[PDB]
From a paper:
We use as an exemplar the successful structure determination of a novel polyhedrin from a cytoplasmic polyhedrosis virus (CPV) which infects the winter moth Operophtera brumata from our ongoing studies into polyhedra from insect viruses.
From a total of 40 in cellulo crystals identified from grid scans, 20 were integrated successfully by FastDP with the correct space group assigned. BLEND determined that the inclusion of all crystals of a standard sufficient for automatic data integration produced an optimum data set in terms of both completeness and R value. Not only does the in cellulo approach reduce the time and effort required, it also maintains the samples in a biologically relevant environment, e.g. in the presence of other cellular components and under cellular ionic conditions.
Residue numbers in the entry:
A (entry chain A), B (entry chain A), C (entry chain A): 1 to 248
Amino acid sequence: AADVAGTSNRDFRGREQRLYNSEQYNYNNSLNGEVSLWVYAYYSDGSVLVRNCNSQYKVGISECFKSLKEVRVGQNNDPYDEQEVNNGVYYPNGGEPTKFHSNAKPRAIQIIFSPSVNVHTIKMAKGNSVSIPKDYLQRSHPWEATGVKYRKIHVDGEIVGYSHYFELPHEYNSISLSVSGVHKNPSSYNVAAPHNIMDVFQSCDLALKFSNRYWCELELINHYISAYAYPYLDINNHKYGVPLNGRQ
Amino acid sequence: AADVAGTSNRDFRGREQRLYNSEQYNYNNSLNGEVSLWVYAYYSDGSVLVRNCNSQYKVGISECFKSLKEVRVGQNNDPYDEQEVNNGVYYPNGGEPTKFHSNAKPRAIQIIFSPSVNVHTIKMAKGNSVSIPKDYLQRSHPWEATGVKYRKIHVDGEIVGYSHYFELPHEYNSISLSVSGVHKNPSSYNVAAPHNIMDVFQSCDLALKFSNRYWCELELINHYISAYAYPYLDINNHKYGVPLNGRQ
Amino acid sequence: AADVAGTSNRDFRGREQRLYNSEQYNYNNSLNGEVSLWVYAYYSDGSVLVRNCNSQYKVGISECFKSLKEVRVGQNNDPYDEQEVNNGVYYPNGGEPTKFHSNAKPRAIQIIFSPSVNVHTIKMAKGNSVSIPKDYLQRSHPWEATGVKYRKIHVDGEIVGYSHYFELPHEYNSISLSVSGVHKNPSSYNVAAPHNIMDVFQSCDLALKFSNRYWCELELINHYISAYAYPYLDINNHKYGVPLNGRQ
Ligand SMILES: Nc1nc2c(ncn2[C@@H]2O[C@H](COP(=O)(O)OP(=O)(O)OP(=O)(O)O)[C@@H](O)[C@H]2O)c(=O)[nH]1
Ligand SMILES: Nc1nc2c(ncn2[C@@H]2O[C@H](COP(=O)(O)OP(=O)(O)OP(=O)(O)O)[C@@H](O)[C@H]2O)c(=O)[nH]1
Ligand SMILES: Nc1nc2c(ncn2[C@@H]2O[C@H](COP(=O)(O)OP(=O)(O)OP(=O)(O)O)[C@@H](O)[C@H]2O)c(=O)[nH]1
Ligand SMILES: Nc1ncnc2c1ncn2[C@@H]1O[C@H](COP(=O)(O)OP(=O)(O)OP(=O)(O)O)[C@@H](O)[C@H]1O
Ligand SMILES: Nc1ncnc2c1ncn2[C@@H]1O[C@H](COP(=O)(O)OP(=O)(O)OP(=O)(O)O)[C@@H](O)[C@H]1O
Ligand SMILES: Nc1ncnc2c1ncn2[C@@H]1O[C@H](COP(=O)(O)OP(=O)(O)OP(=O)(O)O)[C@@H](O)[C@H]1O
Ligand SMILES: [Cl-]
Ligand SMILES: [Cl-]
Ligand SMILES: [Cl-]
Ligand SMILES: [Mg+2]
Ligand SMILES: [Mg+2]
Ligand SMILES: [Mg+2]
């Protein structure tokens, strides 16, 4: 006759559950694991474009002014008029659109990394509308190291991810955007030294990308974030994610 | 008076032909040569999307669920309805398309490598519809090493390429897909060690890509495969390619 | 009472201006600086597609036959007919378009690098319409080193950039195109050796891209080149750029 559940050190079902969750958390943090990046572009109509990349060793996303704009697939997007918006945004008075402010422009950006990133390695190039980091190429460092600004997304006392959020509320907030982060490596084994370097090149090939525009934050939270155990931070500063280490 | 053709060791025209073919085969296998990857997505209407990349040192292709779907350029693709298909495939009951199964979904994938690949280096991430390799990121190795499954495409006793083929016949066969392979290097000279590493970075830049949807396998065989001396394996297990080493 | 402007060595405003310009020029040339690449595709209707990438350490652009073709956003591009053009260009007599020559085909290409490139590192793969560098993969070196052909764009005796220009005036000038260059590094410190290699991988992530089709060379010169202090060479061999080193 077996011990009774939840009363002794022989609840092996319980120990196996805790190990299963701990193994996933720590595997993700091993050099064999993913590091993941999400870039969220929020539009005035309440919809949200997500750009996601999942890869070994390091991960990144690179967007231009045009690629960040809202596209409603299979609906009217006034493509000619929006090309004229682009011309008017690349150079002042450079186009002839029928509008002052395109509602396809993002109102905000949230950058989220998986908990397997090392925040000290995070780099971002938030450039102008023609993809220069700081106004002119000749004065541009090709990135800023913005890790100190990333907030921890905590759930149940566990870091389930990292967030950097900035609004684009002003008419001159017209941007291009690239972001990069490196997977944790507390060892002194360089994953990109000659013993393993070609595998890092293969990781550039193997990185999986995902993009979709969700009709609102609720839908994103329900059918993307929660569905796939991703970290998130909503407009009301509510934290989402699944804590795993040492937990049932 | 010259020797008679095909009767002696002084048929220099004959020797030059054989060397020409041998030189092409072996150049392709040198570190100076191409390694090439083709991903074929087969649709129920009989058409075939090819994605090709040709590059030095290593090569790869990365696709998401959406990018693998059939697009008939300049014809009706019901873009709104197919966006709803995507929503319904990213999460169950997540959309409202007018169909149960999109005929734009691939029925099968064939992955073919040039004979200059080392099959031991082949990696594939066959992920789910939101670009996670194995259901959740926390448990995902970012690839599987599938080389042992690649079949040799033989012609005249020569390996003209390698094939891995899998059908997607079930309703739940909704995938994302990345593939990578490394060019043969039997030497102990690491092409990505510091003496040559920046050239491997340049190869990422220089890799040439090609995509097209052919109306059927016959057309692909005739105007793509055969036209450009590529390897192929058709649905009837017939092998295509041009044998070169030691041959006239 | 301060010295009079432009009469002595105590015009600190003057010295600061000259240093400001010199600092930008030399920063651009430091390993911290950008290296930039522009590929210009010129169309018969006088418009010009620019593809630009700006990145640390090294930079590149890769295009196929299709991606180089003129696309007039929000206007009629006869997409079905132009897909048939593609089929007819990938293989002779392979399509059924309503035209002999597509006016969407580029008439010329100009490749321009920032002055921070090392011309000895420049590589180009000018391939055929199906993205093979030299007719067949088996005989293809994956690039040509074309630096000796690049012309210096001089302004006021300063090199503000480098240009390689080739026309595509013949019916058989149907190409694919990739180009790559490496940022100057006169030091013996290898930026891609293990001490800094992962940063070069991050630079692949962080590279910012830009594309736009301008209606004519005048507009490109005015609202792109000149607006953002880029180098250029127009059809009349007129040089554009801003000289900076040692200059007010
Ligand atoms: N830790 C703790 N949790 C409480 C307390 N009161 C209510 N709770 C709830 O209980 C949850 C934690 O329960 P457990 O996971 O079983 O307890 P634990 O502290 O993690 O201990 P172990 O999992 O056995 O290591 C919390 O998420 C709370 O919502 C309390 O006093 N202490
Ligand atoms: N090898 C071989 N080929 C045959 C034979 N009978 C018919 N053939 C045909 O001949 C072809 C090969 O001819 P060759 O290439 O001239 O002969 P080989 O064996 O390759 O000899 P070398 O090219 O001179 O080294 C094959 O593809 C067959 O289709 C036979 O008995 N032996
Ligand atoms: N150098 C030079 N410039 C001239 C001369 N005559 C007219 N110019 C104009 O003057 C410009 C250069 O003027 P400066 O920049 O003040 O002279 P500089 O030779 O560069 O000398 P510093 O800037 O003081 O080092 C040129 O771009 C010319 O258009 C001349 O004889 N010599
Ligand atoms: N009432 C409680 N008393 C004592 N410990 C608690 C209580 N509730 C939770 N904890 C414990 O405190 C730790 C942190 O959990 P907590 O719920 O505060 O994290 P959180 O979700 O980041 O909190 P919040 O989001 O509310 O700021 C966990 O180990 C948890 O078990
Ligand atoms: N009738 C034959 N007798 C002897 N050798 C042959 C004959 N036909 C071909 N060969 C030789 O056998 C070797 C293998 O050629 P073979 O035609 O069997 O390759 P294959 O195209 O892979 O065959 P298959 O596709 O029919 O399985 C070659 O060196 C070829 O010259
Ligand atoms: N009339 C002049 N007499 C002497 N030096 C000059 C004169 N005009 C310019 N320079 C100097 O000559 C150097 C080269 O300037 P220059 O204007 O010839 O360059 P550039 O723009 O490449 O010429 P161009 O485009 O006309 O061939 C600069 O240092 C400049 O100060
Ligand atoms: Cl590890
Ligand atoms: Cl070699
Ligand atoms: Cl430096
Ligand atoms: Mg607990
Ligand atoms: Mg023979
Ligand atoms: Mg001067």
